[PDB]
Symmetry: D2
Amino acid sequence: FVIPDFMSFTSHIDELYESAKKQSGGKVADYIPQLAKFSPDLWGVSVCTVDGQRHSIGDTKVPFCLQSCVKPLKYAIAVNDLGTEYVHRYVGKEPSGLRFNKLFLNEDDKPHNPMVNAGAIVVTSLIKQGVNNAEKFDYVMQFLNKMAGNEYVGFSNATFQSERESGDRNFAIGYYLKEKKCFPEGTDMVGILDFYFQLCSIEVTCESASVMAATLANGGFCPITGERVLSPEAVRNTLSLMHSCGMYDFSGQFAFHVGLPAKSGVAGGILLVVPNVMGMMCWSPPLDKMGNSVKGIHFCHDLVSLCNFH
Amino acid sequence: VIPDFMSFTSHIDELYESAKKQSGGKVADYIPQLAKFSPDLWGVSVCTVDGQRHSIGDTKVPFCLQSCVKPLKYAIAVNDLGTEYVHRYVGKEPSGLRFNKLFLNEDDKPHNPMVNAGAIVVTSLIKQGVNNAEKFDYVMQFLNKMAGNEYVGFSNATFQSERESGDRNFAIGYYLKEKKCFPEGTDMVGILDFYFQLCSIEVTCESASVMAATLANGGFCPITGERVLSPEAVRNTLSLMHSCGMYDFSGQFAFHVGLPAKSGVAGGILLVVPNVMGMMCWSPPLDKMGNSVKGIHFCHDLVSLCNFH
Amino acid sequence: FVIPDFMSFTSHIDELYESAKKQSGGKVADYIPQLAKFSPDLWGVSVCTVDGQRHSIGDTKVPFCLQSCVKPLKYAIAVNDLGTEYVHRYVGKEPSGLRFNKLFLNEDDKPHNPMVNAGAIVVTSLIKQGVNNAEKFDYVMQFLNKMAGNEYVGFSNATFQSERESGDRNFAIGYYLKEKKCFPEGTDMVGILDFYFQLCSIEVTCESASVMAATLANGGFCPITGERVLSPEAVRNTLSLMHSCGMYDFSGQFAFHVGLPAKSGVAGGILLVVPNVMGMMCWSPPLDKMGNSVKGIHFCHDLVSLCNFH
Amino acid sequence: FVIPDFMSFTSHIDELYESAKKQSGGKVADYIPQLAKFSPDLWGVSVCTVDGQRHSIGDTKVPFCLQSCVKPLKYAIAVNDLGTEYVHRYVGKEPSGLRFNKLFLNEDDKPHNPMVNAGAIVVTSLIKQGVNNAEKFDYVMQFLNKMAGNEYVGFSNATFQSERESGDRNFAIGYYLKEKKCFPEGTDMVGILDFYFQLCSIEVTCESASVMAATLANGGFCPITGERVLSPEAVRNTLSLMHSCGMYDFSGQFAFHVGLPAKSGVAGGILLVVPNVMGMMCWSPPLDKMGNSVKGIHFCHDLVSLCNFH
């Protein structure tokens, strides 16, 4: 009952879709063939409110991997499993002010936030200590399936292989973290990076990602099934981190124009959450210079200019 | 707004006693005019957007708006000129370092209007081409309109000490001048003098609470009802305060309180609850990082008790 | 004598001069009109051996300001007056590794070396404490006249006026040093900066600068007059500093190719010292991208390639 | 003979040795037991002139590993085999001004100098591209045997095993270099790091290291055998690099006090070269805060205070 029209709202959504469809685009990957095979013409939007209302426009049935949209999810899982005090004992909560792949730590020799690469690696290490990687992956997959309301969540072996054979910057970051002793006692760095690469290669559709964001919007209760999947503290911390450093150094400027918790991925996916209202996923393979889809950014700006929100 | 300014005032009056039982740290000691206030001073003022007021403690002792004037001067500049002209010279993103760091962003511009360089540049943008007397008169009239004709004054004793001890500010000003970060036809020394004058404007907790309430209301003074600021100006000011209001601590603050708050070196915390109220907390004691211990404790207790956030 | 013949050597120097004259050049000043009015065709070389032997080629009678070639001389004056332990109580003796006009101090909150701008400002603050600028300038000028063997040393007021109204970076450095308590007790920063600007404006010809370089190479004894002007410790420390960080971030590369104590100024001047052998001055307004005279650098490279020295 | 008496010189050497023997010492390793098993009382000095004159006092027949004293040797080998213009195409020649194990490159995305860890890794990569590690090790060992005049040069398997499983900072540096494509085409980073660890574990005696330094002092001609082992350009570049950044950030300060090309290892070894005169090795397990032997530094300071040298 939060938006009891879903007729003019969807009309405006389609209008914004058509308006943003006119954008040319940009380079997508230019470094690997796995992400360079997607044609730039693909562009889809999926909206899911906190009541179960759903609306998909464009091509929302084409699966794509969650490159950087899984960091809030893994952080929420870690917080729910362990607790805020324990999970923030190893990582910070302030924005670094530099690029996401820079090799440096704060004054406490800890990663600045769970959104940067080092913070993501540490948070991945924190999950299910002293267990085989297969069990960790099964646990994360079942958690994602429960969070998405039993929608389509799958694995992309080719993408995982490409990342594991191309991502040596993450290996440098992991070795640097191991040297500074930022990991919990009794962990294997190579296995941690393998699990991180496996997590980054999980693929979803636009509707499934919209439901996943709507779960965070609702406050840990799935809008479809109604089952409690996350504690309120985990959702609150995830939203705070996404609002603070969701888009890295650009994030603050984003908060100046859109002012919503959103996360951007390499695969051209923008996952945004309007708290107590709804969640959206916008997929557009073409990317701009700083690693964000031009169509997704244009759609978000047009939406925040149209409706009040913010 | 609050149909319980009776029991709500009781909650405020119990958080006041909860935060009073603290020892804390130092006061300031950088200028003699601020290392004089007794550590036991502790006051809270609250003004809702509907005009209801409530104060408890030492809310009638004037104190300088050392670093709490940056949001107000930024709002004045944006209202006078506009968002696109104001941000043509300063950025809108956090720097990730201390407020007095001598470095610019990738575009050779100050990172945000909250650091010292950004504050100086924004000060350079107010009432261009006029002498300092008229600039100060304009700013004081704007502040009087902002506070609903409450107590706003000037502390010359603080201004003289601050003016002769701002070596870092002079270095920042010369660095900005060398990098061509100022509008054409500006005297840097006069800009720094006007900055020192602005930092020395003193208010009580009542007037600061009214200013926070009028920021919460959207440019409309809760008491008088006169529109003083444009919606764009107050929206941008709130966004900047939420993003980088507490400098490198800001994110952590947003992790716990999640409200737009600004902290001064005179032990003042000006916090805004949008569409709800505006509050001012004064406690001259400061911790190791530069915030009042009593004010921070009060903010944490308030956000733990009431939902807000 | 150091050069038993001094006839073949003069022919070699002349042919090196002719070879270096063929260079085109670059920009000259671009920041002040006093140093930007010099025509690129000016190119002169002066040589003075430690035994008094002299040789001048080209237009060496045109005065020019000692912009940044006065730092070794002022450091030598300060060390001779005060002592190594007192002088280095305020400045370091190690290269910074960054640009010369960078605003940062070492781990001890002191200037890295007396060759960067901050170190030079501190050093000129250390000279003749407790006296007004007139007597300071008189003392420095008498010391320079003693160093040059009563050759031509003068003051360029137009250059001084141009500099004192355009040194914003120097003012920022001075205020930064004042804040960090890097100055001796009882000093006026503005007066120190004015004295620094006055010192940078002292002008000489190639002959006087060659005599100064020969005095440094001789161990404090002026080759012409034969009277001591500097203590051995002062000249040794000055030579060590010039070899270590004489050319700022390029210095090491210079030591990789030439391996001699050389100091470069923004007025197209190269002061070269061959210890126990001679001292040379090369003047060419044409400057390169990094702030060195193209003709002077070419002459130094060709000279070190031809003769052994070192 | 460059030293005609060689009787008073040895007497002064013994006096300096006795004077330095009174130093207390400091922590040696405190992180591994392999380097912590050496008793602090060990202290030896060996001197070899360019005429084949040898003199050693102390425990000069106790083998110890060449930890950081092998970087000049490997750089000289690479320059002699390949050429200066090709060797410096991948590494710089300027001091970085920071710690020796910092993860950053210069403005050209190259290691600052061959003395830092990244420069050493790249230099090791430059040697014998596309060849098995056994052949590379045999070539390096035979080159060291020829340079040392067929003295004792051996391998320490325990040290190599301990280093290859503890130095993750080197792995981080190698992965960072591989990300920036600082390596030559067709190289394996893991094999390069294994070869680097093997090279760092080569052990010698004080007498053999003294002969090794005297070979560089003589100018590529072994003082004992008389056979040409290195080109003059290689030894000149090695001496220039050692003088510029032999002791990393402290190096400049060293040049202010001692002013000689010296290299210091973490195994408590100082290898110093007096050009055209002699070469010395000083071994002392006791180490100071910045990673240098206290007895070695004190001996170098006393030696430079007693004789002129420089």
